[PDB]
Structure 1
Amino acid sequence: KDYKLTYYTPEYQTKDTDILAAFRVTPQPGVPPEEAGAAVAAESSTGTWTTVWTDGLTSLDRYKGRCYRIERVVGEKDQYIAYVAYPLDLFEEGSVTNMFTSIVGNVFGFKALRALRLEDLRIPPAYVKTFQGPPHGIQVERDKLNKYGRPLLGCTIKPKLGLSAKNYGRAVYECLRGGLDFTKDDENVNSQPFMRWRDRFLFCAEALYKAQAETGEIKGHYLNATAGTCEEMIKRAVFARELGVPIVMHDYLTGGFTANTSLAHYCRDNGLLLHIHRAMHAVIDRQKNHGIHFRVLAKALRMSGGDHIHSGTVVGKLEGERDITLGFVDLLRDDFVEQDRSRGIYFTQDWVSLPGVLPVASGGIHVWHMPALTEIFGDDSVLQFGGGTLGHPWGNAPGAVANRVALEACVKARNEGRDLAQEGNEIIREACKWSPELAAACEVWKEIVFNFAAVDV
C-alpha cells in the first residue's frame, strides 16, 4: 500500500477549520519519512490500503487526513515530526472521546513505525465552540471564592488510603483552619470498606464549615466523585450539591472523557467547581518516543471540562523541562497562545474565550520553594503541599500557617519590587522572625543553606 502518493500532500494549504496534528514519528528501517507520515494520516482517517467499490459512493479526498509536512528532528536520527490535517467533518461536536478515537485510535499500532508520539494538536475555533469547557474557569472561580492577588493554597490528607471518615474530616478542619484554601481527597479515595463516600462527604462538610466560620475565609475540600459507573458518579455530586459545598473532584483519565464531560456539564448546571486529578497520565505521557504528551491531554481536559488540573511540579527541573511546563500552563490558562517550538508549542492555539483552567502544582513542595513557585507560576495557580503541612513538627494547623505566611511574604516582597529569584532564601529568613510556625518548618533548611540560625533582635 503506497500511501505516499495519496496521503502525503506537501502542497496542501491548511484550512481555518482543520484539526492539525504534530506526530513524532520513528519509522521502521527502510521506511521513508514521506511514506511513514502518509501511513499516519491514512490510518487515522479513511484507512485504506487500496480501493473498494464503496469509496466511489463518496469523495475520498473530502474525509482524508493529509500529511502536509515532514521535519527531521535536530537531535536524534530516525525521528521526524509529521504534520497531519484532518477535516472538521470527521469529528462529532462536543466529543473529546470521538476526537481521540479518530486521531489516536489505530495509528500507534501500525507496523511501518517503531514508535509514535502525538506532541500537539491545533483545535480550530469552529470545533472549540462546540464544547462547554470548564464549568467556571479562573476568573469566575476567584469571584465565587472572593480570593485575589495570590496563588491559592491546598494540602493533601495523608495517608493516601487508610483513614476513617471522621479522622479524615479532623485533618481537613486542622489544615483549613490554619490558612489553606483547599484540602484534597486522595485520587484513590472513592468509596471503600474503611471509608464509604457518603460518610466522608458528610464529615468533610462539617469540618470545612467550622474552619470557614473560625477564619472568616471561604474554604473548600475536593470531594472525589470518581466511581464505577456514571450513575454513581452523578449520585455523589448530587449529595455535594445538597450539602452546599463549593467543589468536587474527578480522575478524568481513569474515569474517562465520556464520564468527565457528564460531570463537567452537571457542575456548570449546579454551580460546583471541578478539580481534576491526572492519575494514570505517566503510562501515556512519560516516554519521549511513544505515547501522547501531556500538553494534548491538558488541551483535552480544558475542552471536556475542569476548573483545576494537576500539572506536576517545577522543583528540581532543568530550564528545558521547565519551559515545556510553562508551555502547557499557558495553553491551559491563556486565550491565545502563539506557536513556539522552544516551549513545545507546535501550533498557534486560539481558545475563543473558552474559560481558562487553574494549574495545580504538587510534588515535594516545601516552604523554601515558595519564592520560586510564586515567580514561575504567578498568581493564577494552586500550590499543593503534602508533608509540608502534615509533616510540620507542630501538626496540621501550624503547618498550614507556615505555608500561608511563607506565601504572603513572597507576594509582599514581589509587590515591593524584590527579585524572588535571587532574594528567595532571604525572604523566608526574614519571615521566620515574625512566625514561630514558619521558623519551626525551616529548621533543617536553615542549618544547610544558612549554616544556622537563628534570630537576633
Structure 2
Amino acid sequence: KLTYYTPDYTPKDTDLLAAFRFSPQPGVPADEAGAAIAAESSTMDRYKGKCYHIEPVQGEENSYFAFIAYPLDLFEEGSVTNILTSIVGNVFGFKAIRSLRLEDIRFPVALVKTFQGPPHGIQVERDLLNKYGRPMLGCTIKPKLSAKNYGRAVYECLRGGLDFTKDDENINSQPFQRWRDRFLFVADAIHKSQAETGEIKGHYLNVTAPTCEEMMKRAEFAKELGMPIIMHDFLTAGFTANTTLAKWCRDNGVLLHIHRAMHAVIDRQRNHGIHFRVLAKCLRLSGGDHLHSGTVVDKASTLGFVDLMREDHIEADRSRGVFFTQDWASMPGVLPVASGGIHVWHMPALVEIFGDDSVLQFGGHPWNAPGATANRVALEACVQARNEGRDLYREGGDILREAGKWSPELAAALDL
C-alpha cells in the first residue's frame, strides 16, 4: 500500500493524471483507499501508478479525492479504448470502497499528439459551412411517418431558416422506414432548400449501425448524396466504432455530430461512475466536430466543459470542475450543442452563456417554417443586441418583445 501512496511525488510533464472521488468502507483509511485505487488501475517499478495527493471533500464526511499519476508508457498511442480500460476497467468494482467516481483526467501533450482529434474542428467547420458571427440553429423533426413525408418536413424547416435538422436518435432503420429511403428523401429536401435559399443546409443523418460495415455503407451513401454532416452515438456504438467513423470523416470531408445518448447511465449519480467532462475530453481526442453538452436553461460544471472542449489551454480551477491544467497542443476544439427544454424565450441566455461557437437544437410552433422563422429572428436579434452592448440576462425580455414586432412568427411564439 505504501508502495503506491507516495505523498512526496511531483508529476512529470508526460504523466497522465487522474482525479477520483471516493467513499471508503468504514474501517478503511483514506490513504489506504487511495493507494488501492492506484494499485488496481496499474501493475517493473515504472509501470505502476502513484497516488500523490489525498484530500477530503469539503463539507462531506467519508468523501475524499485522490490524485493518481500514470506513466505515459502504459497507454497505446491514439487509443481511447486503451486509456479507458486502464483507468476505469476494474477500480469501480473494488471492495474497500463503497463508491467511486472519476472526476478528471490530464492528458499529457505527449499523448494528445498521438490522436487525430476532431475531423475538422471549429474554425474549419465554420469555413466549410460559411457561417460566421453567430451560433447555429436547428431542431429535431416531429413526429419522431413515410420517407416522403419526412423529407417534406425537413425541407420546410430548413427552407424556413434553420441551419440544421436532426434525425431522431432512436431511428436507424425500421420496418416502417428504411434508412436508404430516408437518406434519399432527406437529401432531396436539402438540395431543394439550398438551391432556393442560397445558403448551406444540412441534416444530421443517423449512421449508427449494428456493424462496422453497415456503418460505413450508411456513411458512404450520405457522402454520395452530398451530405455535409452525419450523426453517431459514441457511447452506445462505442469508441472503436466512433474513432473509425471519425477517421473516415476526415478522409472524406464530412462533418461528424456526436449524440450523447446513454450518458445518464454512466454519470447521473454524483457519487459513482464517470463524470461527463471526462467523456467529453475522451471524445475530443477520438473525433467529432459537434457534441451535445446540453443546456442549463450545474452551471459551473457546464461552463467547465465548454472551455475544456473548445480552448487551447484551460487553467485548473476547482470551482468550475477543472482539476488539472490542460494543454491541448493546438488540437482543434469541438463545437458544443445546447439542447433540452429550449425555445425562443431562452434565446438571450443561450447566446450569452455559450457565445458564438455553439449550436442550439430546439424542440411546436402554433403556425414548421414559422418555427424556423421565429428562432432565426430571435437569434439574430440576440446576437446583434449582444454586440451593441445590451445585457442579454436582463434586457432579453425586451429584445425578444421588440423582435416579436418585426416578424409575427416570433410574436406567435412569444405569445405562448
Interval containing the TM-score (normalised by the shorter chain)? over 0.9
Does 1:249 pair with 2:222? no
Does 1:12 pair with 2:9? yes
Amino acid at match of 1:215: T
State the Cα deviation string for residues 98-144 of structure 1 (Å, max 9, x = none).
00000000000000000000000000100000000101010000000
Aligned equivalent of 1:50:
none
State the Cα deviation string for residues 300-354 of structure 1 (Å, max 9, x = none).
1100000000001110xxxxx1111010110011110100000000000000111
Does 1:189 pair with 2:189? no
| Cα distance in structure 1, aligned partners of 2:351 and 2:327 | 26
Does 1:24 pair with 2:8? no
Aligned equivalent of 1:392:
365
Amino acid at match of 1:68: Y
Select the residue among 329, 344, 349 that pairs with 2:321: 344
| Cα distance in structure 1, aligned partners of 2:68 and 2:414 | 52
Q: Moved runs in structure 1, 4+ residues, more than 2 A?
A: none
Aligned equivalent of 1:75:
59
The alpha-carbon deviation at position 215 of structure 1 amounts to 1.1
| Cα distance in structure 2, aligned partners of 1:291 and 1:65 | 20
Amino acid at match of 1:166: K
The alpha-carbon deviation at position 418 of structure 1 amounts to 1.0
Aligned equivalent of 2:125:
141
| Cα distance in structure 1, aligned partners of 2:326 and 2:189 | 42
Aligned equivalent of 2:206:
224
Select the residue among 255, 273, 283 that pairs with 2:265: 283
Aligned equivalent of 1:127:
111
Select the residue among 373, 379, 389 that pairs with 2:350: 373
State the Cα deviation string for residues 50-98 of structure 1 (Å, max 9, x = none).
xxxxxxxxx2x10001111001000211000000000101110011000
Select the residue among 351, 358, 382 that pairs with 1:410: 382
Does 1:173 pair with 2:161? no
| Cα distance in structure 2, aligned partners of 1:427 and 1:326 | 24
Select the residue among 386, 391, 406 that pairs with 1:419: 391
The alpha-carbon deviation at position 355 of structure 1 amounts to 1.1
Q: Unaligned 5+ residue runs, structure 2?
A: none
Amino acid at match of 2:400: I
The alpha-carbon deviation at position 159 of structure 1 amounts to 3.0
State the Cα deviation string for residues 374-404 of structure 1 (Å, max 9, x = none).
0010000000001xxxx0011x101000000
CA-atom RMSD, angstroms? Answer: 0.7
Amino acid at match of 1:440: A
| Cα distance in structure 2, aligned partners of 1:72 and 1:91 | 29
Select the residue among 382, 392, 413 that pairs with 2:359: 382
Secondary structure of 2:309's aligned partner: helix
How many percent of aligned residue pairs carry the same amino acid?
A: 81
| Cα distance in structure 1, aligned partners of 2:355 and 2:14 | 33
| Cα distance in structure 2, aligned partners of 1:174 and 1:32 | 63
Does 1:207 pair with 2:189? yes
TM-score, with normalisation over the residues of structure 2? 0.99
| Cα distance in structure 2, aligned partners of 1:381 and 1:290 | 30
Amino acid at match of 2:183: F
Amino acid at match of 2:399: I
Aligned equivalent of 1:454:
none
The alpha-carbon deviation at position 158 of structure 1 amounts to 1.8
Aligned equivalent of 2:333:
356
TM-score, with normalisation over the residues of structure 1? 0.90
Aligned equivalent of 2:138:
154
| Cα distance in structure 1, aligned partners of 2:173 and 2:332 | 31
